[PDB]
Design a protein around this ligand. Structure first.
Ligand SMILES: Nc1nc2c(ncn2[C@@H]2O[C@H](COP(=O)(O)OP(=O)(O)OP(O)(O)=S)[C@@H](O)[C@H]2O)c(=O)[nH]1
Ligand SMILES: [Mg+2]
Length: 307
């Protein structure tokens, strides 16, 4: 009876939200289901550390220890085993690798790269099983449309998740029929990144063009628009290191979590052309934090209840 549509750019966090609805209302991920994602965890860790040493060549950075070159060679051939763990750990500890990691803005690196790598000892053990946090931290591109059903207070939702990348936005239109509410996810940490499809397009700017399209859409003039400003935990960490001016030349405020976030929210709310007729319900979220998403869900519920 209630249709929920998750929209947003790629890496936005929409699929992580779906995962959280199963954790909260469907009592988590079974031990067996976690073992399913074990390969995904390993693939993500491997792809991340590969992405870093590959960046070094492009970025003119070399190891703090020249002996690592044999480990970097070993990483590619092996692409889990206890030898591969020792190789990755040494590469992650290297001063050169760490320098390149702190320049990840200049290439494409998974959000959860450091999360997995900093916990490699746990990840490398035998009989290791992905934790619920580990599963949420996994990245897998969403291809096609995925639906999910859950019931709350005698109201049950149809949640639709779709791919955010340009390759999949053609299929967004197929879902627009009968949408109660839209949850538009935006990565706060995307302000200094660039799209993986287009090397020179700013990720946040892309997210903006999308939100303008959706927020001021002809089909959705009825539907309530919810704006999820996601990845606030990464934004908090990141805003100290990188200035928000990279995304906005005009921004003269401080590079602080509270003030910078407030600014991004305002720029997205300003895209509403029917600003008097239509309201936008905005919430700051950490999609990997189940407790935080529980609070978000309640906020989503209140917006739908307002009907
Ligand atoms: N730290 C942190 N990581 C997040 C957050 N939201 C998503 N991520 C991470 O970012 C990655 C992308 O999230 P995901 O849910 O897959 O985005 P998406 O919109 O579904 O990506 P796509 O299918 O359109 S391509 C995931 O691997 C997840 O672990 C967040 O709020 N905080
Ligand atoms: Mg997805």
């Amino acid at each position: 009876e209630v249709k929920l549509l998750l929209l947003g750019a790629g890496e936005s966090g929409k699929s992580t939200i779906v995962k959280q609805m199963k954790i909260i209302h469907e009592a988590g991920y079974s031990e067996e289901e976690c073992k399913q994602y074990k390969a995904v965890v390993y693939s993500n860790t491997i792809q991340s550390i590969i992405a870093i040493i590959r960046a070094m060549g492009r970025l003119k950075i070399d190891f703090g220890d020249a002996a690592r070159a044999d480990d970097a060679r070993q990483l590619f051939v092996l692409a889990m085993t206890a030898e591969l763990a020792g190789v990755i750990k040494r590469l992650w500890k290297d001063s050169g690798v760490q320098a390149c990691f702190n320049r990840s803005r200049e290439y494409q690196l998974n959000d959860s790269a450091a999360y997995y790598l900093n916990d490699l000892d746990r990840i490398a053990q035998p009989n290791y099983i992905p934790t619920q946090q580990d599963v949420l931290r996994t990245r897998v591109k969403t291809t096609g449309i995925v639906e999910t059903h859950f019931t709350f207070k005698d109201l049950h939702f149809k949640m639709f998740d779709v791919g955010g990348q340009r390759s999949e936005r053609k299929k967004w239109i197929h879902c627009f029929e009968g949408v109660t509410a839209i949850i538009f996810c935006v990565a706060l940490s995307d302000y200094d990144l660039v799209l993986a499809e287009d090397e020179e397009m700013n990720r946040m700017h892309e997210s903006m063009k999308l939100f303008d399209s959706i927020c001021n859409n002809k089909w959705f003039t009825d539907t309530s628009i919810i704006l999820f400003l996601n990845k606030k935990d990464l934004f908090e960490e990141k805003i100290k290191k990188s200035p928000l001016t990279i995304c906005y030349p005009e921004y003269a405020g401080s590079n602080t979590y509270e003030e910078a976030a407030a600014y991004i929210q305002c720029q997205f709310e300003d895209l509403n052309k029917r600003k008097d007729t239509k309201e936008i319900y905005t919430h700051f979220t950490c999609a990997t934090d189940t407790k935080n998403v529980q609070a978000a869900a309640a906020f989503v519920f209140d917006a739908v209840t307002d009907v």
